């Protein structure tokens, strides 16, 4: 044959047409690893050199076309200089660019999944045929990076700015129907007639019927948008995403900046822009370990998967209590294909739940994001009830009853007598011990903790609080059930405050100290947002609520009095005692986001010193207390590995992604140089006191990772 | 003297501009509203035989439901107008009604008819704007989708020319105040045709004013509203934007020849017509290009125009248009002396002839000679007309 | 000799007429279909700068969803046509596209533009006719509601002139037969612009013919169909009625002056334009009044016309019109020599310019001098145009 | 149109139009004469074979429908036995008219069919413009799936849609009778089985009647109220 590699076999066909096939021999899927990209080069060079070729068809010998790229091999290539990195992806793009420059028609017969680099290969060809049962997209954003193989160059010019920005920024998969309408694909057919379509199409390009040259042009030249049409398009996109992405902007807000700049450029120059910005999101030391993300991700994605083939099926679920949290758990479980029952005691409750679940569904339909037929399915999935008559086939049950140890125990023990004995029970409590609630039940092995965060549909993280008598199967099912609901679960052992919350308040402890030191909270969060945090300390406190934060303070103070039991009134007590209950009340550190000098009056009694501080120190008063507590959560055995200890912060509290995590941030400074930094702030309390184990591994030149 | 085929506007009559959110027209179809208007207007002019109307050119945008299937004929059939006449609906989004005036004008000039009945209608209450919209994804391949959102364009055009929140709100106040004034003083009595409607209690009664007008509109009351198209740093508020209004406007047009024969004194005479295009992103800038083209064809300088009627889409767009037209310092002296779409509402398929009609009343009332009526159009367009009082 | 402001049709290009019930255009928007046509037609004529296009007049009826919000501009923006140009959508039901040609013609004549891009489109597949219809009860107070049902009118006008079921079916056969021939002989190769589509298998391929045509249509197969609008004693069947077709038609128009300068040979020249009205009940009779008015304006007798294009709405209406026009005995010699809407489909907003464009190709091919294109319009209307080959 | 669907003996339909067609160009007074003249023709020809009967017969009905009307029990909560075809319709109709209904069945596969069909109808109207997305929400919430009788506590009227089987229907009917109030009304949707037969299984036949719907439930207007031999008036009235 023309080329017989281990991943790509370029086989010849009729009328000089050649079929470049992707079939990673040995593996189950096709992906652009070092080997694949290498053979592609040899493949293209072969076809290119062969002057007898009259067309090229791209296919796959697997169930999927080409899944994302297995990035573990590309990691060592991102820690080099931005020059030796940009020119690095530049060379990689030379392959696809050349394939796109083949003086012959090229079609991509997409049989199945074509995500990430898989789609980028397709965008390179002239035509693209797709099986109605396939999916395509660019989920790069979930990794903190945007398309690096011409994705930000070809898609925008192929389907249009707005459509590309949406496809890229969101990283959502797209069905044949949608991929065809936006013109990402040129023809959708049944799986059986895929090969015939690609073949019949190529022949129509060769004969001259179809101008394959004219169809390729659009992604070689500038965008068709006006200078004015650009400003509108880009600014709206940027803004829209800027407020929904916050200070820590991975691929969303940057992807648009790259398209806006490479707008008036052709392929070659556009690729350079893509490469440059791509490096800014992947580079090294300057506090930008977007490296640790994958070091944590490639360990959770594997650890979770192992849990996923163990967990029981969650074909039937149910939640105790409607309204706020209940309506969310029901919504999420319904929108992900899991029939859930909304159990409650009064009809007024079910009304609240059904209402909120309906307000969210209509919210998407009243804009175009959700199909009316889909809203129907979701609503049918949610099934109201004031009894336990239908709890006969429920696999996993979640509790959302009012915050009360006694009540929760009665309710939990109650449901345990109306479901199968092999059924899993879980509480959504946040300030009550899971090991305490389990005592009421007669089957603690099936009882665990499933902690969601308000709003249930907004926040990603879901803590799986394992009790002392919780079985592995129990945790496995809960973890899996969380992932199925499009979440990111993390196993955490039972303790006052768990992992996220227990670490989120010490962080706020540093804030409370700043305000008491005459530091303007407005300047504070502006600095914390400049750091990478989604929301600022003061602004976040308003969202959570001053009345809530005040209650949580006592919960953590009682938990670990030795270091989290302050007491000298702070901004928290000030606003609480001043009726400024936060965002829900309409007045907190801000007004509802507005500013007003009236808040200064309330905070005056808290100012104990007009201490001066740089924005650099402000970051320490906050981060140090948060990092150290994480070290304690790892030492006390609240989280098993450092990997889990940081992602719990990345998805929960919203720890800056490109900075890795609390523990990785420590490494970014140096464990030995971190304790030295902490000592200077030791005069602030036990919150800034390094642990014995940290001091021990400080002298040994030991770091949390390697 | 005039030439035989010179276009002459004989009369102008509009309906009371009522709110859409449960206004006075909440129980009246657009077809009937138009049919009634055309019928009543033809009455005041008993010397123009309805049978002579060669064609009825009606403007309308969202042509579906009540407004679908050539509403021009649908509304014409319920009029004293014979079945022997013709009718067509002209859509150009905002400038629909005006384009109608132009079509008939050119027809008359070319000897394809002598008497016409132009105008437009838009019942945004029964047929809202967002109703039945299917955004073509392919449009994003040649132009920004955001340009489809009139509001955002107002924001962009505004940023460019630099118009402060106060500058816009102040404009809205001037519009409401002047509208109320003209109303109270009866400067609208001639153009407004009394029409049946229902008050907030479902009771039947005739309205002869514009519900849309809000005299209490103060800089203080407008500075309380929040940005409508851009919460995080915006100036265009519902107060400085045109109102969603249900309403129709009519206008009898014919040649000076057939006019001189009927011995009826003209209301005005069309001297030049012009339409131009701009980028969708800043469509609000449509008036300047369209105006400049009209002035050249009319062989006139912007200074030769005594009165100006610039349909107020947004204070953010009207002001810039007036600045570049070099007449901002002449506003209170000759620009929308009876208020604008901000206080009188803006019925898409209607505003075209309405602003022009009101333009004539201003000239006639203030001894003006040359007048100008222009307006910006969606998706980047503009249109202008230069009338003349003789 | 030439008169500077004389209207000249430079070129004409239409899309392959495809069925609506799962045809070749079931996956293509009306906007794009129109944009592509306009773009491709402009290519064939590289001597007419798209920037000179003063305005794009597009005809469309059911203006909602894909076809709503001034499709003229929406389709013009995705064309090489600059954003500096304008665009308006003219609706007159059936004769929408033709009225568009008239609007531009008049504009050119009056000196309000030099180059225009007229035409029309109607994707009855994505935007069906009965879609979004709200019959105004008030209409029954001035006219029979039944008149709204084109079919019933065909039945009524048919009975009056006495056209037998055989006479109608025979006409349909003539249409299909003559359409297939013109297609096979390549008498459509110049006007039909190849266009991408999808076959019954979802496959992508370019069509350059009309799916609508059915060569197997025989008197035997037609006499098998049942009355479509009157089961108990009807003649108008789906076979003698025009087809529901998705399609677009374009036409570049300009003044003879700006034309002579570009040294491009004219395809035809507009001599007279006319629109007339009739009773809704027998709307199909619209052509005769409109035609007579056109002939008088063109100073020509019906006999002076070499070829005629009568939009075949219903065999029951086409025949009567041809009889009163006194040319029924001249049919096979000069009437719809390439078939009609029965075999080529009748895209509401498109048929206007389509039949006119085809008319020109017939003349050019058969050395004709004077041509006539006319069509009946819903709710009682008619429109006619008399071209000339020079 | 009326001539064809009224046929040879045309009462008021075909005549009313001939009366208006003639008095068309006339004013009130002259039109009144036309109306009167034609009215006499109908009374002495077409309707001579009693106008009295049709009238008094309607009289009996408006009173009967009224007697039933306010002795009848208010149906605030309803439920249907069996989803799928007939169940999804009875649930749809009860939901679209402001009546919370329960879709009871034995297997999860059934509830799916019901919820699906009810959804297909609701989306059908929204996907063209006749129904509000907010309205489809209410209707969907009105329908509450279930595989038990735990929530049948406040149901006032229960409808059965189980497969055509005398034995099965009897078992199901008698079953639900032990999970609802005693004053609740039960009704079968059967079409080929005697209501008087089914009632024998129940222990409260007075509350059992027959409520016959026609496929499709949302299309056909008529609903037969098959009264059994032991059916109380209150049962039928409700
Ligand atoms: C180019 C051209 O020719 S036209 C361009 C096209 N533009 C348009 O079609 C108009 C665009 N405008 C719109 O779409 C709408 O008016 C919007 C989106 C701006 C606002 O609509 P909404 O978001 O629904 O807000 P809404 O209209 O309900 O706000 C009304 C409130 O403003 C207040 N308000 C409005 N105008 C005034 C005023 N002049 N003075 C004081 N208060 C006012 C009302 O009192 C009311 O307050 P309340 O609710 O407490 O009673
Ligand atoms: N208005 C109108 O113009 C007409 O009333 C129409 C076009 C809407 C009528 O069409 P519809 O009512 O939508 O469809 P209709 O019920 O007539 O059925 C069409 C059938 O007639 C057939 N048909 C139509 N015209 C002809 C003809 N000239 N010869 C043979 N068969 C024909 C079609 O092939 C189709 O049959 P199929 O479904 O087996 O393919
Ligand atoms: N503040 C927040 O938004 C937030 C954040 C994180 C976690 N949570 C968790 O959410 C839970 C609180 O839920 P909520 O916010 O909906 O409270 P809520 O007061 O808003 O609503 C209480 C609901 O529980 C129902 N309920 C009470 N007792 C019941 C019983 N015995 N059986 C069945 N239903 C019963 C009530 O009818 C009502 O619908 C707690 O576990 C809390 O830790 C809340
Ligand atoms: C009419 O309509 C009725 C038939 O309805 P159909 O067309 O939906 O029949 P069908 O066969 O289409 O569906 C039967 C439905 O009844 C349900 N069902 C059967 N036995 C049941 C039981 N014991 N308890 C609860 N649900 C049970 C099934 O699960 C199914 O959903 C008859 O009464 C006929 O006369
Ligand atoms: C022509 C006569 C034919 C006679 C047929 C005899 C049929 C008799 O069968 C008896 C009915 O069997 C009932 C089936 O039991 C179903 C139990 O479903 C329980 C569902 O529980 C769900 C808990 O969540």
Min distance C312 CA to chain A CA atoms (Å): 33
Give the tokens for residue B390: 């003789």
Q: Both C81 and C207 in a single domain?
A: yes
Three-state DSSP at D217 gives coil
- Of the residues C270, C301, C318, the one at which a domain ends: C270
Ligand 3 contact, A414 CB (< 6 A): no
Q: Which 8-state DSSP code applies to residue A641?
A: S
The reply to whether D30 sits in an annotated binding site is: no
Q: Which 8-state DSSP code applies to residue A171?
A: -
Compare CB distances from D4 to C131, C132, C232 and report the shortest one's residue: C232
Three-state DSSP at B163 gives coil
B29, B90 Cβ separation under 8 angstroms: no
Compare CB distances from C201 to A129, A193, A209 and report the shortest one's residue: A193
Question: Could you tell me the residue range of the domain that residue B362 belongs to?
Answer: 137-186+271-387
Q: Do the chains contact at A362 and D126, CB–CB below 8 Å? A: no
Q: Both A10 and A40 in a single domain?
A: yes
Q: Both C7 and C110 in a single domain?
A: yes
CATH number at residue D116: 3.40.50.720
> Please, what is the angle between helix C150-161 and helix C315-324, to 10°?
40
B199, B205 Cβ separation under 8 angstroms: yes
Q: Do the chains contact at C132 and D4, CB–CB below 8 Å? A: no
Three-state DSSP at B251 gives strand
Give the β-pairing of D101-104 and D78-81. parallel
A504, A554 Cβ separation under 8 angstroms: no
- Of the residues A458, A476, A497, the one at which a domain ends: A497
Ligand 4 contact, D162 CB (< 6 A): yes
Size of interface C-D (CB pairs under 8 A): 3
Min distance A206 CA to chain C CA atoms (Å): 13
Three-state DSSP at D182 gives coil
Question: Which ligand 4 atom is the nearest neighbour of the CA of D171?
Answer: 23
With b for 16 or more beta-carbon neighbours within 10 A and e for fewer, the A316-326 pattern comes to bbbbbbbbebb
CATH number at residue A201: 3.90.226.10
Q: Both C23 and C67 in a single domain?
A: yes
Ligand 1 contact, B315 CB (< 6 A): no
Question: Which ligand 4 atom is the nearest neighbour of the CA of D107?
Answer: 29
- Of the residues B225, B240, B270, the one at which a domain ends: B270
Q: Do the chains contact at B77 and C297, CB–CB below 8 Å? A: no
Residue C140, chain A, CB below 8 Å: the answer is no
Question: Which ligand 3 atom is the nearest neighbour of the CA of A430?
Answer: 43
Residue B142, chain C, CB below 8 Å: the answer is yes
Q: Do the chains contact at C131 and D4, CB–CB below 8 Å? A: no
Give the β-pairing of C115-122 and C245-255. antiparallel
Residue D125, chain A, CB below 8 Å: the answer is no
Q: What are phi and psi of A445, to 5 degrees?
A: -60, -35
Residue D149, chain A, CB below 8 Å: the answer is yes
Q: Both B174 and B199 in a single domain?
A: no
CA of D122 to the centre of ligand 4 (A): 22
Determine how many CB atoms are found less than 10 A away from the CB of residue C114. 19
The reply to whether D169 sits in an annotated binding site is: yes
D60/C344 Cα distance (integer angstroms): 60
Q: What are phi and psi of D57, to 5 degrees?
A: -65, -35
A485/A338 Cα distance (integer angstroms): 8
Give the tokens for residue B52: 């002579």
Alpha helices in B64-149 (DSSP H): 71-76, 96-109
Tell me the β-bridge partners of B249. B14, B120
Q: With contacts defined as CB-CB under 8 Å, which chain C residues touch B142?
A: 77-78
C298, C105 Cβ separation under 8 angstroms: no
The reply to whether A403 sits in an annotated binding site is: yes
- Of the residues B270, B292, B325, the one at which a domain ends: B270
Q: Both A197 and A219 in a single domain?
A: yes
D167/D178 Cα distance (integer angstroms): 17
Residue C200, chain A, CB below 8 Å: the answer is no
Q: Both B217 and B120 in a single domain?
A: yes
Give the tokens for residue B88: 């067509």
| Residue C365: exposure state from Cβ atoms within 10 A (0-12, 13-18, ≥19) | middle
Place of tokens 């150290």: A628
Residue C88 half-sphere exposure toward CB, CA atoms < 13 A: 33
D145, A380 Cβ separation under 8 angstroms: yes
Tell me the β-bridge partners of D211. D225
- Of the residues A497, A515, A533, the one at which a domain ends: A497
Q: Both C356 and C222 in a single domain?
A: no
Give the tokens for residue B350: 């209607």
The reply to whether D162 sits in an annotated binding site is: yes
A525/A529 Cα distance (integer angstroms): 6
Q: Both A267 and A120 in a single domain?
A: yes
Compare CB distances from A232 to B139, B141, B146 and report the shortest one's residue: B146
The reply to whether A500 sits in an annotated binding site is: no
Compare CB distances from D148 to A362, A377, A392 and report the shortest one's residue: A392
The reply to whether A170 sits in an annotated binding site is: no
Size of interface A-B (CB pairs under 8 A): 63
Q: Both B289 and B363 in a single domain?
A: yes
Q: Both A398 and A300 in a single domain?
A: no
- Per the entry, the structure determination technique was X-ray
A170/A163 Cα distance (integer angstroms): 11
B100/B91 Cα distance (integer angstroms): 9
Give the tokens for residue B131: 């109703």
The reply to whether A407 sits in an annotated binding site is: no
Give the tokens for residue C310: 């009568």
Question: Which ligand 4 atom is the nearest neighbour of the CA of D162?
Answer: 16
Q: Both A517 and A666 in a single domain?
A: yes
Compare CB distances from A201 to C27, C201, C204 and report the shortest one's residue: C204
C 110-129 near B (Cβ less than 8 A):
110-112
Neighbours of chain C (3+ CB pairs under 8 A): A, B, D
Residue C101, chain B, CB below 8 Å: the answer is no
Residue nearest to atom 27 of ligand 2 (CA): C239
| Residue B365: exposure state from Cβ atoms within 10 A (0-12, 13-18, ≥19) | middle
Cα C143 versus chain centre, distance: 27
Q: Both A236 and A366 in a single domain?
A: no
Number of domains composing chain B: 2
A9/A6 Cα distance (integer angstroms): 7
Q: Tell me which chain B residue has its CA closest to the CA of residue C108.
A: B106
Three-state DSSP at A703 gives coil
A672/C306 Cα distance (integer angstroms): 100
Q: With contacts defined as CB-CB under 8 Å, which chain C residues touch D129?
A: 132
Q: Which residues of C are catalytic?
A: 94, 346, 376
Q: Both A265 and A387 in a single domain?
A: no
Closest CA to C275 of B54, A370, A470: B54
Q: With contacts defined as CB-CB under 8 Å, which chain C residues touch B289?
A: 84
Q: Do the chains contact at B111 and C66, CB–CB below 8 Å? A: no
Question: Which ligand 2 atom is the nearest neighbour of the CA of C217?
Answer: 29
Q: Which 8-state DSSP code applies to residue A342?
A: E
Q: What is the largest CA-CA distance in chain A?
A: 87
Q: Do the chains contact at B64 and C62, CB–CB below 8 Å? A: yes
A655, A649 Cβ separation under 8 angstroms: yes
A639, A633 Cβ separation under 8 angstroms: yes
Residue nearest to atom 11 of ligand 3 (CA): A400
C235/C315 Cα distance (integer angstroms): 10
**Dihedral of the CA atoms C171, C176, C177, C178 (nearest 10)?**
90
Closest CA to B269 of B258, B250, B256, B252: B256
Neighbours of chain A (3+ CB pairs under 8 A): B, C, D
Q: Both B14 and B116 in a single domain?
A: yes
B325/A579 Cα distance (integer angstroms): 54
CATH number at residue C100: 3.40.47.10
Q: Do the chains contact at C64 and B62, CB–CB below 8 Å? A: yes
Instruction: Please provide the size of chain C in residues.
Output: 390
Residue B141, chain A, CB below 8 Å: the answer is yes
Give the β-pairing of A317-320 and B204-207. unpaired
**E strand or H helix at A8, and its extent?**
strand A8-12
C347, C245 Cβ separation under 8 angstroms: yes
- Of the residues A455, A472, A497, the one at which a domain ends: A497
- Going by C-beta distance under 8 Å and a sequence separation of 6 or more, which residues neighbour residue A451? A428, A429, A430, A462, A463, A464, A465, A498
Q: Both C336 and C193 in a single domain?
A: no
Q: With contacts defined as CB-CB under 8 Å, which chain D residues touch A375?
A: 133, 136-137
B350 in active site: no
Cα C49 versus chain centre, distance: 26
State which of B127, B226, B238 you would mutate to test the pocket of ligand 1, scoring each by most atoms of that ligand within 8 A of its C-beta: B238
Question: Could you tell me the residue range of the domain that residue D199 belongs to?
Answer: 75-238
Q: With contacts defined as CB-CB under 8 Å, which chain A residues touch C196?
A: 210
Q: Which 8-state DSSP code applies to residue C242?
A: P
Q: Is the peptide bond before D216 cis (omega within 30 degrees of 0)?
A: yes
Q: Both B233 and B380 in a single domain?
A: no
Q: Which residues of D are catalytic?
A: 212
Q: Both A472 and A529 in a single domain?
A: no
Q: Both C142 and C221 in a single domain?
A: no
Residue B141, chain C, CB below 8 Å: the answer is yes
Ligand 5 contact, D163 CB (< 6 A): no
Instruction: Please provide the size of chain A in residues.
Output: 706
Q: Both A441 and A470 in a single domain?
A: yes
Q: Is the dihedral of CA A675, A680, A686, A687 positive or negative?
A: negative
Residue D137, chain A, CB below 8 Å: the answer is yes
Question: Which ligand 1 atom is the nearest neighbour of the CA of B225?
Answer: 32
Q: Both B142 and B214 in a single domain?
A: no
Tell me the β-bridge partners of C122. C247
């Amino acid at each position: 044959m023309i080329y017989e590699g281990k991943a790509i076999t370029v086989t010849a066909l009729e009328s000089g047409i050649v079929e470049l096939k992707f079939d990673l021999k040995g593996e189950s899927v096709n992906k652009f690893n070092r080997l694949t990209l290498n053979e592609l080069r040899q493949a293209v060079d072969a076809i290119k050199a062969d002057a007898s070729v009259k067309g090229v068809i791209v296919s796959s010998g697997k169930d999927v076309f080409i899944v994302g790229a297995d990035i573990t091999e590309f990691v060592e290539n991102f820690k080099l200089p931005d020059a030796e990195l940009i020119a690095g992806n530049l060379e990689a793009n030379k392959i696809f660019s050349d394939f796109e420059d083949l003086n012959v028609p090229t079609v991509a017969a997409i049989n199945g999944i074509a995500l990430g680099g898989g789609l980028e290969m397709c965008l390179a060809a002239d035509f693209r045929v797709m099986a109605d049962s396939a999916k395509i997209g660019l989920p790069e954003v979930k990794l903190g990076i945007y398309p690096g193989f011409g994705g930000t160059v070809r898609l925008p010019r192929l389907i249009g700015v707005d459509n590309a920005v949406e496809w890229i920024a969101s990283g959502k998969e797209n069905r044949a129907e949608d991929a065809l309408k936006v013109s990402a694909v040129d023809a959708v057919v049944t799986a059986d007639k895929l090969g015939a379509a690609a073949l019949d199409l190529i022949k129509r390009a060769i004969s001259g019927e179809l101008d394959y040259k004219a169809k390729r042009q659009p992604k070689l030249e500038k965008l068709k948008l006006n200078a004015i049409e650009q400003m509108m398009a880009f600014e709206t996109a940027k803004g829209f995403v800027a407020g929904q992405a916050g200070p820590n902007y991975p691929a969303p807000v940057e992807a648009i900046k790259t398209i806006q700049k490479a707008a008036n450029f052709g392929r070659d120059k556009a690729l350079e822009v893509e490469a440059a910005g791509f490096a800014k999101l992947a580079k090294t030391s300057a506090s930008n370990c977007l490296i640790g993300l994958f070091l944590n991700d490639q360990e959770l994605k594997k650890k979770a998967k192992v849990y996923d083939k163990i967990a029981k099926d969650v074909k039937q679920a149910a939640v105790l209590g409607a309204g706020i949290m209940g309506g969310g758990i029901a919504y999420q479980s319904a929108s992900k294909g899991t029939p859930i029952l909304m159990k409650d005691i009064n009809e007024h409750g079910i009304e609240q739940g059904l209402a909120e679940a309906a307000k969210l569904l209509v919210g998407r339909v009243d804009k175009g994001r959700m199909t009316p037929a889909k809203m129907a399915e979701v609503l049918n999935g949610i099934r109201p009830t004031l009894s336990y008559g239908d709890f006969g086939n429920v696999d996993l049950v979640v509790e959302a009853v009012v915050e009360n140890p006694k009540v929760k125990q009665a309710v939990l023990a109650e449901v345990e007598n109306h479901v199968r004995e092999d059924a899993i029970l879980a509480s959504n409590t946040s300030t009550i011990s899971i090991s305490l609630l389990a005592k009421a039940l007669k089957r603690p092995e099936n009882f665990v903790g499933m902690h969601f965060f308000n709003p249930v549909h907004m926040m990603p993280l879901v803590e799986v609080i394992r009790g002392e008598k919780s079985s592995d199967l129990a945790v496995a099912t809960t973890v899996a059930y969380a992932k199925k609901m499009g979440k990111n679960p993390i196993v955490v052992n039972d303790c006052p405050g768990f992992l996220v919350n227990r670490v989120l308040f010490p962080y706020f402890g540093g804030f409370a100290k700043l305000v008491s030191a005459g530091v303007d909270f407005v300047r504070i969060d502006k600095v914390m947002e400049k750091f990478g945090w989604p929301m600022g300390p003061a602004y976040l406190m308003d969202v959570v609520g001053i009345d809530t934060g005040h209650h949580g303070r006592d919960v953590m103070a009682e938990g670990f009095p030795d270091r989290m039991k302050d007491d000298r009134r702070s901004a928290i007590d000030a606003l609480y005692e001043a009726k400024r209950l936060g965002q829900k009340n309409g007045k907190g550190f801000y007004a509802y986001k507005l500013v007003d000098s009236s808040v200064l009056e309330v905070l005056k009694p808290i100012v104990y010193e007009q201490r001066d501080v740089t924005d650099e120190d402000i970051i320490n008063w906050m981060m140090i207390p948060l990092c150290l507590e994480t070290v304690r959560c790892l030492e006390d055995g609240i989280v098993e590995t450092a990997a889990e200890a940081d992602m719990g912060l990345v998805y929960g509290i919203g720890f800056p992604l490109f900075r890795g995590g609390a523990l990785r941030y420590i490494d970014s400074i140096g464990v030995a140089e971190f304790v030295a930094l902490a000592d200077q702030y030791a005069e602030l309390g036990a919150l800034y006191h390094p642990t014995a184990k940290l001091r021990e591994m400080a002298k040994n030149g030991q770091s949390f990772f390697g | 003297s005039l030439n035989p085929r010179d276009v002459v506007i004989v009369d102008f009559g509009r309906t009371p501009m009522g709110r859409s959110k449960g206004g006075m027209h909440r129980n009246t179809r657009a077809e009937d509203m138009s049919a009634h208007l055309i019928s009543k207007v033809l009455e005041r002019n008993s010397k123009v035989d309805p049978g002579e109307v060669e064609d009825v050119i009606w403007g309308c945008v969202n042509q579906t439901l009540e407004q679908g299937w050539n509403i021009a004929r649908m509304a014409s059939l319920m009029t004293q107008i014979p079945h022997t006449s013709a009718a067509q609906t002209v859509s150009r989004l905002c400038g629909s009604s005006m384009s109608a005036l132009h079509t008939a004008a050119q027809a008359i000039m070319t000897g394809n008819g002598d008497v016409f009945v132009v105008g437009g209608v838009e019942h945004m209450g029964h047929v809202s704007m967002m109703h039945g919209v299917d955004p073509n994804p392919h449009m994003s391949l040649y132009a920004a989708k955001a340009s489809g959102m009139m509001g955002l364009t107002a924001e962009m055009l505004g940023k460019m020319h630099g118009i402060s929140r106060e500058q816009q709100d102040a404009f809205a106040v001037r519009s409401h105040q002047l509208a109320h004034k003209a109303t109270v003083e009866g400067k609208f009595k001639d153009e407004i045709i009394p029409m049946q409607g229902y008050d907030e209690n479902g009771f039947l009664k005739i309205f002869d004013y514009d519900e849309t007008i809000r005299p209490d509109t103060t800089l203080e009351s407008l500075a309380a509203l929040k940005p409508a198209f851009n919460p995080k740093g915006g100036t265009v508020t519902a107060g400085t934007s045109s109102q969603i209004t249900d309403g129709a406007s009519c206008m009898i047009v014919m040649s000076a020849q057939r006019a001189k024969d009927l011995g009826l004194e003209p209301l005005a005479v069309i001297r030049s017509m012009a339409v131009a295009g701009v980028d969708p992103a800043i469509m609000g800038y449509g008036p300047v290009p369209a105006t400049q083209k009209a002035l050249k064809r009319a062989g006139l300088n912007m200074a030769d125009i005594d009165f100006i009627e610039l349909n107020e889409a947004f204070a953010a767009q009207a002001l810039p248009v007036l600045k570049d037209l070099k007449v901002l310092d002449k506003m209170n002296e000759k620009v929308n002396l009876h208020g604008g779409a901000i206080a009188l509402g803006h019925p898409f398929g209607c505003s075209g002839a309405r602003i022009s009609g009101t333009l004539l009343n201003v000239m006639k009332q203030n001894g003006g000679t040359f007048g100008l009526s222009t307006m910006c159009i969606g998706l980047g367009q503009g249109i202008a007309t230069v009338f003349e009082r003789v």
